[PDB]
């Protein structure tokens, strides 16, 4: 707790797997607000 400025606190990324980013993106799906609608399924529709 005492002010310490001699250690690297960003060590969590030493054990990130290949799917870490996509796993986090999957967890941030129930918080997202509903997307806007263009009105068509795609520009080719």
């Amino acid at each position: 707790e005492p002010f310490d400025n001699t250690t690297y606190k960003n060590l969590q990324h030493h054990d990130y797997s290949t799917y870490t980013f996509l796993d986090l993106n999957l967890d941030l799906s129930k918080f997202r607000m509903p997307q806007p609608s263009s009105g068509r399924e795609s520009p080719r529709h």
């Binding site: 263009s38 009105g39 068509r40 520009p43 080719r44 529709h45």
Partner: protein
């Protein structure tokens, strides 16, 4: 794409027979007016020349491309089919 050859009226005659020279196979003709092209500034100038020389003439009215609305922003449209899939 150049449009500089579509600015003057022309008067060409009907195409007559071309046959094959028996010696060298060239294209022979008996039509003295097969290579006759006249240039006129206006349709009325061309019609006047044709009637003066007694020829029968058919007039084709000029075809001009119509003005078109071209927007580069329509290439990226929120809800229209004009959005391009590639650039």
């Amino acid at each position: 794409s150049g449009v500089n050859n579509t600015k003057k009226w022309k008067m060409e005659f009907d195409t007559r027979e071309r046959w094959e020279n028996p010696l060298m196979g060239w294209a022979s003709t008996a039509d003295p007016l097969s290579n006759l092209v006249l240039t006129f500034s206006t349709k009325e100038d061309a019609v006047a020349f044709a009637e003066k020389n007694g020829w029968s003439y058919d007039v084709e009215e000029r075809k001009v491309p119509k003005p078109k609305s071209k927007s580069y922003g329509a290439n990226f449209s929120w809800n229209k089919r004009t959005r391009v899939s590639t650039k």
